[PDB]
Amino acid sequence: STNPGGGGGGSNPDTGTGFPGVSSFSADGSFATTSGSAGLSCTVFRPSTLGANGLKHPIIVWGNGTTASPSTYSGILEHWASHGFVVIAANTSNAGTGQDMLNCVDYLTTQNNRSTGTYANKLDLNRIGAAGHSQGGGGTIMAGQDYRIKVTAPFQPYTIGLGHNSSSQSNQNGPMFLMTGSADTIASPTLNALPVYNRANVPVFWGELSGASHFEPVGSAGDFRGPSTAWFRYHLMDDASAEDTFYGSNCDLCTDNDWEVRRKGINA
């Protein structure tokens, strides 16, 4: 949380990659947003103007929970877009293999590399993260093996079925912000998340939110919204103010009794 600008009604300085600073990770940011279909089988939520002020936009690829669509998560996806991310959701309700998510990344790469178009030279292909809920959180871990996925944020992942291959957990490309809810009886954290924490080959920040059901991530994603935004702003925008959300002995979530935190490979 620590920011030299002091937040609030002040004006926090730009991030390391040049994106506007924000006074809150849970409130929407300064970019007006739009959404629409992308490549037939994806849906994008993005700033309505891309590439202003010399910026190249980081990307979050999203996988839905079982039975769900991108609209089920429109609040959280629009929220990230309002901070400056280009957010691409696989449309599928069956995101567990990770392949649809990676196809959405391939699609945006093509568009970035065109001479003209919505995305032409406007994306930062070195700053891609993955996130998703439920089976889509398992799919985030599956997709997170790919060398282009810099960090992941699985929201209540389901890893005991629905396309998951648990060996993916030990083949991640980058660090993981693993989120669970203590009231989640559908993707039991003991069965679905504890094994990921144990076997992951990367640093893991595992936060379990007290009193969160399996439906906390739907819509605007509740009390996961701010933390997930901090994670992606830190790693994909070099927002230094998000560092002490996760790192150090006195990190924000570490001293917040609403969270049970288990870390590995994270400076503490």
Residue numbers in the entry: 20 to 287
From the paper:
HaloPETase1 is a salt‐tolerant enzyme and depends on higher salt concentrations for the degradation of PET at elevated temperatures.
The crystal structure of HaloPETase1 was determined to a resolution of 1.16 Å, revealing a unique active site architecture and a lack of the canonical π‐stacking clamp found in PETases so far. HaloPETase1 has the canonical α/β hydrolase fold illustrating highly conserved spatial positions for its catalytic residues S156, D206, and H236 as known for IsPETase (type IIb). There are two disulfide bonds observed: Db I (C64‐C126) and Db II (C273‐C276). While two bonds are characteristic for type II PETases, these are, however, located at different positions in HaloPETase1. Notably, we could not observe a disulfide bond flanking the active site, as it is known for IsPETase. In HaloPETase1, on the other hand, we observed the non‐conserved aromatic acid Y180 in subsite I (equivalent to W185 in IsPETase), which might form a π‐stacking interaction with the substrate. Further, we hypothesize that the backbone amide protons of T88 and Q157 are responsible for the formation of the oxyanion hole in HaloPETase1 since these residues are located at equivalent positions as M161 and Y87 in IsPETase. In contrast, HaloPETase1 has a distinct and extended loop (loop 3) due to an insertion of five amino acids.
